[PDB]
Design a protein around this ligand. Sequence first.
Ligand SMILES: NC(=O)c1ccc[n+]([C@@H]2O[C@H](COP(=O)([O-])OP(=O)(O)OC[C@H]3O[C@@H](n4cnc5c(N)ncnc54)[C@H](O)[C@@H]3O)[C@@H](O)[C@H]2O)c1
Ligand SMILES: NC(=O)c1ccc[n+]([C@@H]2O[C@H](COP(=O)([O-])OP(=O)(O)OC[C@H]3O[C@@H](n4cnc5c(N)ncnc54)[C@H](O)[C@@H]3O)[C@@H](O)[C@H]2O)c1
Ligand SMILES: NC(=O)c1ccc[n+]([C@@H]2O[C@H](COP(=O)([O-])OP(=O)(O)OC[C@H]3O[C@@H](n4cnc5c(N)ncnc54)[C@H](O)[C@@H]3O)[C@@H](O)[C@H]2O)c1
Ligand SMILES: NC(=O)c1ccc[n+]([C@@H]2O[C@H](COP(=O)([O-])OP(=O)(O)OC[C@H]3O[C@@H](n4cnc5c(N)ncnc54)[C@H](O)[C@@H]3O)[C@@H](O)[C@H]2O)c1
Lengths: 337, 337, 337, 337
Amino acid sequence: MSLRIGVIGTGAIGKEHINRITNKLSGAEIVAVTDVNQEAAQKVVEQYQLNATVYPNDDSLLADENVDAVLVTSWGPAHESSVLKAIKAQKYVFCEVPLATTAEGCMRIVEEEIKVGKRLVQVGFMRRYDSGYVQLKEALDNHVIGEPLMIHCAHRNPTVGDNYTTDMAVVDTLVHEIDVLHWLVNDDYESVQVIYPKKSKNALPHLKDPQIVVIETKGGIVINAEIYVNCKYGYDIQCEIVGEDGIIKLPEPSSISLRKEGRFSTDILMDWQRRFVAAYDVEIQDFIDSIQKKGEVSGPTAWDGYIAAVTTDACVKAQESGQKEKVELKEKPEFYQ
Amino acid sequence: MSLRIGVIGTGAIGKEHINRITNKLSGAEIVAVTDVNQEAAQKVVEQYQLNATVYPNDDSLLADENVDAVLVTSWGPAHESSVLKAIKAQKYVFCEVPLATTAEGCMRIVEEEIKVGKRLVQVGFMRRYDSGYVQLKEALDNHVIGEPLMIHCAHRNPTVGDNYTTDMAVVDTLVHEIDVLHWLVNDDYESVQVIYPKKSKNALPHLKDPQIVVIETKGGIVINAEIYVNCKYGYDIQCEIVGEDGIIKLPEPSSISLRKEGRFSTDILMDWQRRFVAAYDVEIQDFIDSIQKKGEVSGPTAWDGYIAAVTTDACVKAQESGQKEKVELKEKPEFYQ
Amino acid sequence: MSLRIGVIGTGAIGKEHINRITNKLSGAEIVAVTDVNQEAAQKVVEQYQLNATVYPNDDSLLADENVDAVLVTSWGPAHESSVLKAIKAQKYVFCEVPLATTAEGCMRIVEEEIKVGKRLVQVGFMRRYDSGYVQLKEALDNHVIGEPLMIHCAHRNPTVGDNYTTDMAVVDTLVHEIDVLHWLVNDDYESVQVIYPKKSKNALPHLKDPQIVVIETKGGIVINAEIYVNCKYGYDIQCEIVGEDGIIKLPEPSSISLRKEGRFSTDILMDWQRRFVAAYDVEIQDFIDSIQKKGEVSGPTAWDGYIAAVTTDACVKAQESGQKEKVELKEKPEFYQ
Amino acid sequence: MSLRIGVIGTGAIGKEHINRITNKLSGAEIVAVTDVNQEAAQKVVEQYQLNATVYPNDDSLLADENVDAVLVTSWGPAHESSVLKAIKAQKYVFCEVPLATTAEGCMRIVEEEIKVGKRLVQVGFMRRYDSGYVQLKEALDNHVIGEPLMIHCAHRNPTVGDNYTTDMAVVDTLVHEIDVLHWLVNDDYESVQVIYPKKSKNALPHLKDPQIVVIETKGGIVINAEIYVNCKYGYDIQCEIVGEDGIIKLPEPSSISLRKEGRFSTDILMDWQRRFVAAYDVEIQDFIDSIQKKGEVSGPTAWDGYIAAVTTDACVKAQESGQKEKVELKEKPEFYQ
Ligand SMILES: NC(=O)c1ccc[n+]([C@@H]2O[C@H](COP(=O)([O-])OP(=O)(O)OC[C@H]3O[C@@H](n4cnc5c(N)ncnc54)[C@H](O)[C@@H]3O)[C@@H](O)[C@H]2O)c1
Ligand SMILES: NC(=O)c1ccc[n+]([C@@H]2O[C@H](COP(=O)([O-])OP(=O)(O)OC[C@H]3O[C@@H](n4cnc5c(N)ncnc54)[C@H](O)[C@@H]3O)[C@@H](O)[C@H]2O)c1
Ligand SMILES: NC(=O)c1ccc[n+]([C@@H]2O[C@H](COP(=O)([O-])OP(=O)(O)OC[C@H]3O[C@@H](n4cnc5c(N)ncnc54)[C@H](O)[C@@H]3O)[C@@H](O)[C@H]2O)c1
Ligand SMILES: NC(=O)c1ccc[n+]([C@@H]2O[C@H](COP(=O)([O-])OP(=O)(O)OC[C@H]3O[C@@H](n4cnc5c(N)ncnc54)[C@H](O)[C@@H]3O)[C@@H](O)[C@H]2O)c1
């Protein structure tokens, strides 16, 4: 007997989630969708031969008693609104990054979930389900390299559109690093600082590219993260953790090697979409499985969404301040441990 | 509306397939099982909370009109029998390696499928679905390295039981290499030769370990394959294809690197089961998807099973002959292209 | 007819240079030595069966008309003194790092060389002769990756003695990085900043280990350099240069790979001495060759020594300031380009 | 007091040896040369400003009492002649591969050295001095992987001239593999077999390219060696040794990695000359050093030359026989152990 899922926002990524749930995962179906372009959400129901109702807005869909759970996968700032409603309507919500665009927005959502007794909210930080990052986690949990002291990491992308703005680099992009990193090391951010290198010839005039972002935790781990979204060569995620007694490092995506015209090579991806395909699948399936076999959700929490929001804010602050901004977090409610 | 699958042989591997279909894949269910230890097949229905009928034998299960398709995943020599029945009962059959234990056994099965008009039989040669081997295929199809001339490859395993016999090395083990290799290069085997190196201290007395197996295709590709099932260090599959203008090579499984006590390392698997987990999933899902969206099966064919059987036989021949045995194949029926 | 070399300071490293010149290189001999422990200098002349005069002090040795060139390889702060003397005595001087321990000390030496018409002083920054760094140089000179924007690099060492102090990390250690990096990118340092991560359990109480050192050039290249001298795992130099259109990276030292007990590994060196052995050889041979076939020295210059001194000072400043210190350099005299 | 060396054969490779001895190594000089084109030998003496006598033939040069040692570096079949003379004239001889072009030719040379009491003859098999091969040796000597069982290896070259003939592949090319491999594993060859794969489009019509060469030792190690001299992509030497409990593998030559246009790459050499440059240097220096500090030569022996000759012959035999030829070696004289 399969979980009945309603999708809010049938854009490019909500279309990807509809396809995995329909044709790749196990034990769930899409019974309802609503988009803001109601005509698009009516061409998607046909496209994937869904057996689903098409609502004009969220409220209508959240009223429907079929739907046990919703995917929030619409425009970014329209998230907070739909999550609060779904919590009050007491449905399970899988909400794509970001949880909300402001730090208080995330706080409002925590307070609601806190009331409604159990965990309803999983945030779509898929990196925690990628086998690379899972292995790093395992080695750290095993004290393979003793105490983490520094982290170097990088998030690069071939080119961006006319729409990509200086803040998006730390809000839409460095956001997964921010989530995954503190999950691995089990610590909280303290300060953030932003440093701009010589600007790239591949960056448009309004964009500042690359950027380095230093970040210290409370324990004193020092992270420096490079964000270069016009690197031209490929899409590439690198993460090295230096510990007291050794170093561990994230793998490249699997690739056949080639020997030809003087070079020994492997392939680098050009498409951010392709990089985490497996972790999307495993993440959703875990929302599904965790609900039917526990009565609550298991992944990244509303709280983790809140931590991403505060730090993301401090970054955008140190971004035009040029100074060493501070990251101030409220006490972690007993609810979340 | 999901495909109704009956499993013949609820052993260790048929249990793995029941679990992927039940809890990982999409659009199919297990409605029927039969084992030879009928008590075991009645503890498996409970184990995975299946909603399935338990038959005493294949015939009973193949009569059941629920079941559209069957997994043949029982003892090895009990395959041919169950496949012929399922073809005549006109159900879709996914049959695990081997198709049958004798070369004529595979021929009998081809003749039956040939009659019944369309493709019912997929053979479980999962390597063709592994992303490594898929990439090699893609580069060869693109003429990246021109004409294949030689292949070097290796199939190693830490240790084997008291049950592992000299012939099993080319019958149960080198069998996937044999299937996958000719699929990649699109050619047929001509001769096989077997050469025994100094015998390993890790091999039991009745077993001959390692072995090298040279194999020539009709076009003149020269393959040498190493089979060392007591290599102790790990489970490891290596495949290098040398072409006219360059070389392509299979990847290692993804692993975090580590720097500690004087060494820079990655992990090697110890468990053959873990190596191809993803290709099992993708293989089954493709049996499922290909049936509901085409009315026939798509994978490795009954014919490919026949090619594996002939070559596997010539190998066991050159295995105790010590001579350069021959591989003689019947004409490839128009049915299969 | 071979170059006659006098060695000032017959310690451990001056002994290594006497051995290479005597038994490995071409076209030079040691005809004179002086140490501060004059007894040790005699034991050296005997040890390497030298045919050399033993002076009580530098002045005596610089008077000797045999010696065309001197190695300054004595205790650190005793360098400046011996280099000024050798310049005025008008001999060729190869001076090991540092050129002098203060920034003005290097300035005094530049002024002397400036007068004496030609280049007499090569500083022993051997990295410029290592084949790795030579290749990076070549790729940058060829615009392979366009404009350098950032550099990440690391200098790690297993453990240090009771004698290793917090400033030595940027004075004795990060000093080669400081020389080589601006040689590669052809730019000058502007600011330096020092950040202390959580302190290591492998570091003694008086030592601050690791450190991160951020450094910006005038053009805007942003360098972050990690110095971890108690990393325990090995001796390891890493340098990655991120450019506009691609990334280039320093190689590991050559090593046989090994597959054993679950791991695929290569070796990491435990001894800083072993890492640059080939660049020492090539460096000295180039002092020799460049003198006999040009009448002047070719390597890193007295000026480059001065640049290392100013930046080294700013680092030690930002080291206890905790602030973003500045690097102020005098105009580059026409003499040096 | 430096070793006085006479060079027989001032061709391209004898010119390289004259240059290293003159301008790179320590403790030796060229005091005498003779070529067959006596005019070329004069132009060489001038080219490298040598202080040397120019003889019309070997006999004259071997009479000269200056010369303690000779390099035999002339045209291939002219080696045996000059080595026998030098042994009887009782000079030290460094003889480039091959020692002689026939197996009995090597036998005549062994018998002469055997009489003259000590070791005069070093054969120029430089691989034993390359740091890669030295490391493999060390790991095998340490039983790191237990008992060697198989070896896979390859010798590839971009393209060859109109002058390169099918036999040269096993006589001029596979000859270093043949020497180095039995040195590593400390065993003797027993059989050889030659297998021709589909012929390459890069090979001329008179040449058979690639070839595989299987070789068994007495102990039962099974070696398969690939020789592809028109592989087009680069010059590339690969050697993998599979032992009982693990695998060891030769390194690639050091290279900077690059990330650009979709690929992560390293460089492959195009010039056989560049691959072993360091082992040539270390090899010669060891002829020199071993003579002045022992009164005999240390490297590969006249005997090792003989072993290469017998096996080289068996290969050329199995090369047009198509059969499994045999390698028959005379008893190893007590003189050589
Ligand atoms: N975790 C990740 O790596 C990742 C990757 C990509 C995108 N995302 C996130 O996914 C979201 C969507 O991404 P996208 O690039 O497909 O954007 P998109 O523009 O394709 O999706 C927005 C769609 O939702 C509709 N919409 C907006 N508000 C709505 C509302 N309140 N109710 C119903 N429909 C509404 C719009 O009409 C549009 O069709 C964003 O929040 C983005 O940050 C996360
Ligand atoms: N493609 C691969 O990499 C791969 C891997 C592992 C196993 N296999 C194949 O899978 C098959 C099973 O493997 P396994 O190791 O789990 O063996 P297993 O012993 O666990 O499975 C045999 C089971 O089937 C039952 N059985 C035998 N004949 C039967 C019949 N006619 N009808 C109903 N039940 C029957 C037995 O009682 C037993 O429970 C073998 O043929 C093997 O070659 C293939
Ligand atoms: N470039 C490099 O990779 C590198 C590596 C190691 C050391 N060094 C540098 O080289 C220098 C020498 O190192 P070391 O380890 O041989 O030193 P050391 O302490 O081992 O010995 C130096 C010797 O010179 C003597 N000496 C001191 N002052 C003298 C003077 N005025 N005149 C003559 N002799 C004098 C000392 O008594 C001692 O015997 C140091 O400055 C060091 O920092 C450079
Ligand atoms: N070990 C290695 O890596 C390696 C590499 C290249 C070549 N070699 C070998 O070294 C040898 C020389 O190679 P090369 O390319 O310099 O040869 P080359 O043909 O370029 O020149 C050899 C020179 O010696 C002269 N010569 C011939 N016979 C002579 C004799 N009896 N006495 C004096 N001079 C004589 C020739 O006229 C010529 O000028 C060859 O046997 C070759 O196979 C070994």
